[PDB]
Symmetry: C4
Subunit: 388 residues, 4 copies
């Protein structure tokens, strides 16, 4: 018997520390590793797990040629031990999916899995391994979800779902799901947020989601959500923006609207509110998906003339490829510890990755109330050693 996960505050932290790293591309040199992208991490009562969207092919085989393609019927959400490379001998297949989210409610896993035609997709809700509910595409344009962990409070899980065009109009919703049954949904208000995709969420009493505006905002949109409703929305105030591409630091402080510059295409990313301050992950490059750093911006959560980057940890050098990044939480004593993963994409379309496939490895970090050291934890593969 296990209770449902509760609404705990975020633990205090002052830096991020290297946790797990899978070295999946390096370890895939002899064709053992499953091709993936859009990885994330989520934990149950006992263990943290790696999740990713597999491509139904082994890295370096002929079927891996062309895996830059985002949506195929051969993509499945898979789970494998955290920090391990995904191989046929260690993975589990969760569901057929080209977009997904997963979260553990304290008793069972819930997953949200989208698959099917772009104009007629459906999301399958899996709870305790059983398919319990579904969502039908209502805008017939790539029904899609977080690509990282959802969050559950007192038995009700909250997940962000989008249907509609990129870089233009589109519907953005939150769904509330309890024991695998959809309870209700809300259309996200568009008073502030103009575009929202690929939300990265965590719990700090309430659920906070920091997402991707792929049209007009180089600043990230966000929502605060509880077990019943959407409480607040906005864009991250920080004049130091954290999407990619983005303007050079320092840029504009826009708490209530997109920056209206360098809006697309964006990249999935995350952040953590801490009092009036905010921590934001971002690529080191302002233009491309290279490097990864996390910054703390003093008073960055609020409207203030005092935004300053008080801390910058460079975790993946700008000479190394990155990709999506997302938040996850780990229960501590009476608080949730903030953690994140970084997707390290290798292959197409990265300049000079002369192989025909596209895949990734993973690195992860967790927050502690201690001072960090420094290092660099990139994918580490020599692309010239790899089967093409």
């Amino acid at each position: 018997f296990r209770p449902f996960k509760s609404p705990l505050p975020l633990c205090p932290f002052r830096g991020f520390f290297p946790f797990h790293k899978d070295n999946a591309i390096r370890l895939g040199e002899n064709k053992d590793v499953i091709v993936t992208r859009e990885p994330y991490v989520s934990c149950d009562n006992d263990n943290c797990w790696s999740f990713a969207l597999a491509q139904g092919a082994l890295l370096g085989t002929k079927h891996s040629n062309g895996t830059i393609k985002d949506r195929t019927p051969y993509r499945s959400l898979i789970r494998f031990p955290i920090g391990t490379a995904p191989v046929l001998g260690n993975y589990k297949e969760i569901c057929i999916a080209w977009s997904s989210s997963s979260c553990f409610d304290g008793k069972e896993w819930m997953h949200v899995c989208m698959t099917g035609n772009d104009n007629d997709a459906s999301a399958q809700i899996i709870y305790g391994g059983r398919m319990t509910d579904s969502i039908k595409s209502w805008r017939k344009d790539i029904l899609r979800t977080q690509e990282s962990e959802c969050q559950c409070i007192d038995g009700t899980c909250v997940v962000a779902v989008t249907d509609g065009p990129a870089a233009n109009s589109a519907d953005y919703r939150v769904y509330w799901i309890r024991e695998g049954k959809i309870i209700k949904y809300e259309n996200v208000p568009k008073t502030k947020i103009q575009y929202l995709e690929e939300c990265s969420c965590y719990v700090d009493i309430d659920v906070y989601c920091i997402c991707r505006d792929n049209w007009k905002g180089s600043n990230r949109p966000w929502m605060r959500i509880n077990n019943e409703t959407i409480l607040e929305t906005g864009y991250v105030c920080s004049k130091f923006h954290s999407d990619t591409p983005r303007p050079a630091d320092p840029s504009t402080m826009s708490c209530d609207s997109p920056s209206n510059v360098n809006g697309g295409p964006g990249v999935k990313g995350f952040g953590f509110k801490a009092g009036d301050d905010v921590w934001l992950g971002r690529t080191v490059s302002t233009s491309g998906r290279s490097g990864f750093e996390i910054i703390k911006v003093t008073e960055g959560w609020i409207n203030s003339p005092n935004h300053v980057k008080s801390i910058t940890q460079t975790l993946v050098s700008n000479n190394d490829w990155s990709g999506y990044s997302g938040s996850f939480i780990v229960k501590a004593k009476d608080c949730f510890q903030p953690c994140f993963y970084v997707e390290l994409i290798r292959g197409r379309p990265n300049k000079n990755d002369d192989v025909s496939w596209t895949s990734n490895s993973i690195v992860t970090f967790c927050g502690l109330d201690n001072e960090p050291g420094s290092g660099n934890w990139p994918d580490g593969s020599n692309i010239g050693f790899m089967p093409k």
Copy 2:
């Protein structure tokens, strides 16, 4: 402590949704995957599992040459995580078998495994991992069983077993087995059913089995069974037939006899009675094992002038190979959810699959009381990429 599975009704449903897909042939390009055919799915209290008859060889090796052959001593029933490809690092060997059925009674797994010479086979009954009973061939002509899950109610498992020629006379029986001990059997009445093989069964209070007539019927025979006896028998009334080959729609309504057209060879398939209606899986082709669709036929379970195909979901295109299909159930709150798998056969004898082996992948779907979208989930292998 777990109770025996009970006689629950089928859940309401109005469409089928993509669940798990293993992409086993694609993932087998580098010779990691075990050669199989006749797969199925069955679930215990905690997990659903893939089962299949392995061929005692890895795909693309020299020993895989000629695996079109149905019965050898090197075939074993194996189990592997649902939606995963079967590899040496993840499989379990259940028993030596070239025909099988498995079901979980709420406490333990039962398996029925036939092996040996065509004219002197025996079925081994395995219960909780121990060999507990057996059936000796009494007609000395390929003693054989469902190739999908059996069903257990209140501790008594029911399984269909056949001994005798194809496309001609033969004995068809149901066996009742409790904690691995055979309690009784009955010869299936031949008042209506003329041929019965490869039953696909599920629970809707009672056990319903929809099977394969490989001689005179393009319509499928069926039985309703409880923990003690056979309650009813017939052929599916639907004027839209669901075996392969079969006449073009619309055909004859034959509730009580084979259609007497396009009788053989047939293919293993399934259906679900829903009130007076029936859902039937079938190949898209009326002649060959290509494509897969499921249809709902209004009043298709009964004698009626009003049969109409109210819903048709095309799940595997007619340009893609299919194969056997079968039902399985998953316990929900107070009902059983109807699900099915489709075997996607690649290799011999499929036209233009120029390899020497025969194997399959798996895709699965479950029923929900929601409207589905649309898509296509075929095997997906480029046969020209495969080791021959």
Copy 3:
């Protein structure tokens, strides 16, 4: 909490039925499988397991060349799921060993593992994964044990151990071990038995062991043992002998001494006393390790003029290689079910197995009180397909 295994009688049986088969050599064609020999089977409360002496090399690699050699420091007792091929992704290493025995006492596994120099070996006793005791070679000539499961009654495990020359003098002992601690040993009386090695044991209230005389007896020596002492000894009375080599049927009835013909080298084998009758496994060939059959000899356990082979099941044809065979038991309701495995050796020194390695696969059978069918379950590998 689990009780110690009790002294139950053997279940009634009238035939043997195919259980698990690993097809390990066939599945090893692509170099995935660990080289082994001297396999056996033993079960705990929940599962049966395969055990074997690995050679510290993968089949078909350069390190597999020369693995006909019996004793090296690179041999370990390994365990893997019953009926699966042993691969790096599924095995467990139990202990360093070039001779072993294992048994489960109802609570924990005990293993006996010999390794080291031929003239200074030691046996390590492992209990619940901990090394708890040891036996030092006292004759300095290949201290060695059963190569199949030992037996435990009411917490005391019994295992046969030999030290000394082949085809000549030597010490034969039984050891009693409780929770991994050696309690006592006895030198086996030489009033009847003249040579004893590689005992195959089972429980029928008491422990019965049927062993290998490698010097003067083509008939098999046997012992009856309880939790304190050796109760009786003899040679199997049956005038149909069951070692290899052996005289043609019918031969001499020798209840109390070796046959004094075709004495060596012998092969590990087994049998089951059933009332006054006996079941004996044997190679089909009277000269070599080819084929496998089991016979029932009426009144074969006793001195009688009425010995007749009432049943003969041929399980591996004489055209196929066999090897060691041994008994194991599986708890049923209030009796122990008799089962056995057969080692199917491929490679050196088998005529026309033109490879440089030596390894095996496994097939297993269990007894039921039903009539069997017939079949053939040999290794099944085409040696010409194998890496040499």
Copy 4:
């Protein structure tokens, strides 16, 4: 519910016996095995486990070229079943690490993982799978730890940590950690010990650590520690030294200071105090990392004119490569059994290992109060068979 491990005495023993051996290099001939070094063993309530620092590459692949390098971001502490080779299908990734220690407190695993830049490393403390605390490099010169198991008494784990130069000044500390939270640390007194690295520890009521002086001592430094503080320190009195390199036997008795001869570079090793006597592991060679033997020195723990080598077991011949060695304990009834592992390094820089990689296999031994036999258990690989 499990209690914390208690302060038990060491069991009596008079010799060491072969336990588990992985044969990892032999089994890695076909590129299945993960490249490692700095292995060790540690046990929980149920099982013993192998741990090692992986190099994020498979043995014999192009990424394995150059793995002699000690510290990279691609190194992770991994865990795999004891005596098995580490492969993608069986390993778990514990944390990112180029130096580590692990121990089980009776309830959960704790790990200490150092990674990052040489001049700015941090140690992450993992407890029950969660990152709970950290240590920041305070001397900015390769913050580092035991490379073998730490020890926990009554819930408080003790681990030795070093920061600073080799063969010169440096800080050496002990940290006390409880449920993953750092409680306190102490700088090790330098009244006797002048250099301390890579401590091998065990429990004999208190924690005893025997370590490596890499500057001035061919004799090994040691500490005795309890759940609150450092109790005593010294160098092992034995006039037979046990580091590598070292003077030939017999050398100087130095209980309170380094020998001041053959001081560096040293090698990680271990020993066990037994009354006034001491057991010491050492390479057979006095100059290089070849062979392995363990000696008992009568009165070797104390200042005495009577030091004599009463027992010498040669476990790996001087013709075979060895490497690091370390202690671990296994709970027996009311005492802890002393055990050890030996790292068997193959590849660079070993003379005539003409491959581009560096890796290891493992062999292990445990102490019993019985007389041992003799044997040789080296790595066993033919380096000429290996992919380079």
